[model samples]
Target chain A: MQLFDLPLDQLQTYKPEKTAPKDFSEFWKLSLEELAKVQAEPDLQPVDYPADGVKVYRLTYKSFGNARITGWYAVPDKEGPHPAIVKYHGYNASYDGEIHEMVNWALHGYATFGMLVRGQQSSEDTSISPHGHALGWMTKGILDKDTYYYRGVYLDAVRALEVISSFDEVDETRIGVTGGAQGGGLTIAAAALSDIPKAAVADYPYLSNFERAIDVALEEPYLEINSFFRRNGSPETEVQAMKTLSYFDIMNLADRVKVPVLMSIGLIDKVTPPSTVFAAYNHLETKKELKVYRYFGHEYIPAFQTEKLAFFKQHLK
Target chain B: MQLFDLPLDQLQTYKPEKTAPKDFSEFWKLSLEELAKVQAEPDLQPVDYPADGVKVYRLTYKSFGNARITGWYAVPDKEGPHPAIVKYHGYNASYDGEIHEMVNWALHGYATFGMLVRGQQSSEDTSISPHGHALGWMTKGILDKDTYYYRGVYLDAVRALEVISSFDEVDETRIGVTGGAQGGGLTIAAAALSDIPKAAVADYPYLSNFERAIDVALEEPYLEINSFFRRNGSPETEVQAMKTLSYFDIMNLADRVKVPVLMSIGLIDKVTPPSTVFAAYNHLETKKELKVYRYFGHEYIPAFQTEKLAFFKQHLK
Candidate 1:
């Protein structure tokens, strides 16, 4: 009954699903159609926030219904409409601050825009109450795809790109997108559907192929969904909801992206489990590469983000 | 100003300190006084939850003040006087339903006990809802050495050992203590100060050295205290508050731990930084060894837990 009771062969193991997606195109098109069917409305407007000498704006609109989603925008001081890089924030660190948008990319040569999903408070952008439960939010007013939890966030991401292209300082033709975790999943979605972002980078992504993740992920958010359904005794609808999530699955979007992508995955990440990450990577249609962290987890720490930046600059400028 | 514009050295660089305590005996004595001050009060009682044919109990009792803390306990169906493990839960997964306590240790021929702090949950065992801007139940009544946030949890940890020993099916003298993160820290404290456990295992322990952790580590729960002081504006009295914490610091109790101890440390962990763990590892007077996971984080996986069991079974029997 002790920990070592199992042999080393059984103890040290990671088994990936054999039935992974064969291509990204099929995944992307299906998800795109699902999103369109959700009555997603795009709002492109001049959204601004005060950032000493930095032009910070907001991207607000409704996704799924009237959820009032928001995003942060920062245009560089440089002239001639610089190329835009739509930066998606990391999980937990999402929607942090407009000042961050200015400092990280816009302060340099590129115009930066950060998509603010409904839940995160880090963006320092005052919007909604930011009040919501983990997976509990998904079940409420639960009727169909239009009422799904992620419908709002996904529409907000697409709207962010739509408005960025209209900015005078942005070279609409050279825009790129990137994010980590939930943000990473959105990045893949942007690269797939949006004609604007020339390339994308996904770092240790999450929220893909729920059927696979919920089956093995020993972590939260996903577990929250499983726990909710378990408590409700309606696992049938829960599985149906998961199948619907596959429409927005990042791996599904990778093949449709004509642009190149750079990604990172941690081998020992129980939270995002390497199998799911590779499921997306292997499905990417365009030229792509993945950097594997042998011992890290949901975090692609130890300079992985830095490498990603270098990769972006090579194609972005 | 971009993530890429920063020097690569700054982005990926981390300096780990290997500092050792000046005196182990002083550290050990101080921690015992901290727990004793809180535990000297009334004895706690255990609450039960049945699941999968196993009975899981939540032990509740008063610590420094009227603080009602709770712990998880699981008793097997087999006959009398069984081997027991004072099972400490992980940081985020601390004593929850009976299923966790049962699966954690009971499956291994040992009765398991999981402890909860004063402010954790509404598990029939609590008396206070000390949560809000500053005074969460754990920190609600903190004013003296006996009333700090951790005082209740540490005392609760100790009292749970007493509760386990009181059970007929538990082999009192053979009881061992173990956990990761906060649980690891408590196990180290209880095994070091009390005569309750015959063996102990700590995994990526927290609550090691407060001063060092706040100054050096970047992870949370510990960072929470630092942020609380900073946001609330640090008063001169905050130092006095930390002095109260000095009593429960793990390094201060390591020398008194007579049982054999197995500890794990994840080298790249920003949480419970390895230096603080080493500060304790080097200070222990008991026979001990460390299983270093060069790349894991605070949540030591099942594989590592198995390694810990092997270490205990080799000598505890």
Candidate 2:
């Protein structure tokens, strides 16, 4: 595990031109406005879990396109106006019951929302095409930004943050967003779009810098998109796909992030690739810190577990 | 990458029977005594490096068997009695300059030692058979505890900690030990064997549960030992090898650690399996924290990077 990316100095200077669509801002603005109209209190129920000091709840909320989303929510058993951490999970990740690590934050006397991404786990489905492409969700409606898979996922994450912040147990102004891989992309999305998070931790974020990830990555996820294109796409179709991806790119969204963002990148990451992480990080106009792992891959960092808690404790407090 | 070892519940309760030799305590006690007998100041010469606010030095010190070991040392330019970190490197790792990563600690107003392990890089040679074995340093002198590769490396690391404490710029009582892979194993050895380190961080440590690593590892280092044994070892010889290895097993040494220990394990590691890391971690009788990376492999956890700094800052300070 030597360097699998550009040299550190070269990686620092890597800021490629954004390929975001002209209507990017307006698209998200109208989407947020639409979400505002359909918003209602999430149906929350207390779960019979044995986490001693934490009250875990299972919640179902309507998100992007009014899609029903399922999630695990937890709060300190004795808490009022506690700071919250709006957490997101990786794509299609497993959980250890109705409590998928949200209890950890709740133990810290904070509310935690572990929102399941739409079309995954117990969440509602997206309007994806039943077409012959890749096995995963990357290439669905690739030619249109409005119909792209992540457009819903990203919005769903931000919508989860907004809905959860409304809970009486949570202090709305002191919210932090965090996740790894696809969850990281969602965290970045909420940090940029929602303005609810005071701080953010995005680790090895996926769905970032689409064209670059497709070109340099030697792993899946991005390769899922490439696999779909190889059989069903021409060079022109590929170009059109990238144009739609630009709207969903976190690098394009990063400049809008008003919160203190802490990110991590595995230099040897074959899944998200270092340059793609750097692309999103470099575009951040707010206070940000990047933890670079030269020897790791597409996994969440361990030390950042403490680092992030320390980060949020300081920033969110 | 998922569970390459046991289930999570089983892993937490995964304490296997110890295979430590009856004379293990005497072996280490004598080794520590022998090191104290040859105590001398390390030869430190300032190196010209362009790091901001840090003074870099190249040092050579005598360790077990009076082997000369070389390393990069750095101290804050304006500091006296600063808390220090005695950092060991992975097996034969590269450095950006003579500074290595010691400068990062130096920037935080502390001393950092990037010690080169014996028989690698600028360190002195070890006695070994130029026998047919798999590539790497793992197989040399496998059957004899006295001549084993790690016996010297561990002693050399502990010796480095002692000598580095002699420096005026460092706060001897507030030292921390850290490393990744082979370096991580060295950190555990020092934390357990020496009384100097106030805190310790070990990440995906190599040279842990030797028998388990040799049997389950699908990668090099441990496999190097297995490959050599496959060609020449009988069941009797393999038994003899493990008996010698028991003396150096971190699981055996873990009980000796008086300092707060922080450890990480990549669950999917083919090199040092999670069970092996857990074997050692479960043996610790002191304050300890284990960061489990379920989606990761043999590499150091990136978040643990910030986590380590945060840990050492709290404990070592």
Candidate 3:
């Protein structure tokens, strides 16, 4: 569509004109306090997905309202208080049972934590309700921030940090986080909500600016909300959906991030839409850099993981 | 998983051990002769897609069993007989109605023909029966090579080249072809079947080595075939399916390509599988170069369009 959304020059500075919720901070604070009431009884079990020099374990922990979150943890043989990285998966994707994906982090001497978001691929069913596969989570409990799906997901991300910090082989202060798409959004949100990750890297972050995303994106996962609206929305439900989303938008979270961040955006990406990415990127108050791929779409960037590894090594190592 | 296909060292030399049908050449020869019996009856109509320096037209041509194929044809506004490039689209996709996608080729002084395969997004309909969208075209009509879906599609590609060569504005001797994924597969097939294209480009082409692709790919379009086998195939059907696929394998087609070719493969592309890509790439008997994107999955390579433009300019211009 001729790269239809936004021109490059304008996209670099694009931020949603919409303001954050009046009590966005208060809402998060209350949610965190509610989450604090639950004991994050973290459990670790060793797994035998043999790799070159890595020892792998499966970790499960309690998050918001007693939801059990799952992750794969891997450590190098000679590790002791090693720099750690908390990994998050893309939308609806799960870490393979084998730790092959995160073995590189272990190979690089970083005790790795691959967190699974609630009600998503790896995590056990949400402890509250709807304990099954969901086609659309964006509007799941759209009318209230208190029961929204991501409220649990965000809390789970925070819980993952706590789990990693408890690991004997992990250096609690040298932790970093990374992911793409949904995970990218979680990376920024986790960095803002807690000071656990010293550095963060996101690639084409999803769930950032809902206001802009729903307007420009023509692809799936994002269009699920639009489908919901076309099928069953009234003026009241539409208003409620936007209100609930404001509490979870990563753009608002970006303002609170205190750590260095690295992001990659694809200009032709209709999935996240370049404007939505810049919306969060422009609002970040911390040290940050954006690597823009002009003709790419919503897929892996060439040699991006190597650059990401270098970024983590510079900060966490 | 861990790119569990062949390692790069072996992948460079990886050629499928499977052999083509003994009468592969005779089958295509007889099929082209059957197609030649029908008049192409090419038609063109000007479209209203506004481009600053390009003129656009809707082109319709006849192919296998008189099936009416559609394509977007664009030519630079200024000039004598211009060099031309025939384009093929990825799986289940069509050129935008606005012609925004192909304007750059016209602007670069090339008469561009973007062919839409039969029963796909833009074509009128298939000339043959059972003209509908199926979840697994890979297994469609698997009992016989004569009735397979790609047999018609490969013929349509050759028909497209014949139609383009007949264009008065296109210098018949200076034609090129390119596309990614399914289109890439078509590029190699069309070049093999006909000598019309002086040069060709394919990126992470699908429909290459059916033997390797079915084994290594965990993603859909490929998995659709696996699902079909699980549900409806007997051991007899399995043998028949493999025999039918042998007639259409791009690796077999790659051996017939006589033109200079440019191909790109992503080492981590589990969808096409790097080994599957190499299976076809290693079989090419023509002058060719393969660009490997190391950390990329089934996605775009950074600045790949520029490299393609240079390739076309070198040959077509």
Best by lDDT: 3
| Ten-residue region with minimum lDDT total, candidate 3 chain A | A125-134
TM-score of model 1 (CA atoms): 0.45
Computed on C-alphas against the true complex, the DockQ of each candidate is: 0.01, 0.04, 0.02
- Model 3 CA deviation exceeding 4 Å by range: A95-98, A127-134, B1-317
What does candidate 2's lDDT look like per residue over A1-317, in tens digits? 55777888989989988877889999889877766776755899988654345687888888767789888888877748888887877766635322625665675556888888776678876566744557878888777777778777777888888787888778898989988888898899888888788899988888788888889988787888878788776888878878888888899999999889899888888878899999989998999999987777776555556577668778766
| Tens digit of per-residue lDDT, candidate 3, span A1-317 | 34878899999778776557889999999988988898988888997653335687888888887877887888877749889989888887663532555654665578898887777766865544332222567767767788788888898898889879887778999999999999899999999999889999999999978977888998878887787688655888778778888889999889899999999988889889999999999999899999888877888775455467668878987
How many clashing residue pairs appear in each of the predictions shown? 21, 3, 0
Query: Model 2, B83-135: lDDT tens per residue?
Result: 88888777756343225356656655568888887777778865565344456
Per-residue lDDT tens digits of candidate 1, residues A1-317? 11211232332343333332353346445545654554435444554332222455665545434445656666654465777787776656542443343334654456787767666642222223232324544343233444455555665677667667776667888888888887788888777777778888888787665667777777665676676566656567666555556555766656677888888877667767676777777777688888876656776464565566567667777
**What would the C-alpha RMSD of candidate 2 be, to one decimal place?**
9.6
Clashes counted in candidate 3 amount to 0
By lDDT rank, best first, the candidates go: 3, 2, 1
Worst 10 residues of 1 chain B by lDDT: B1-10
Show where candidate 1 strays beyond 4 Å: A1-317, B1-67, B123-143, B232-235
lDDT of 1 by residue, B180-215 (tens): 887789899788657989888888788786777887
Rate residue B1 of model 2 by lDDT: 65
Better of 1 and 2 by TM-score: 2
Docking class of 1: incorrect
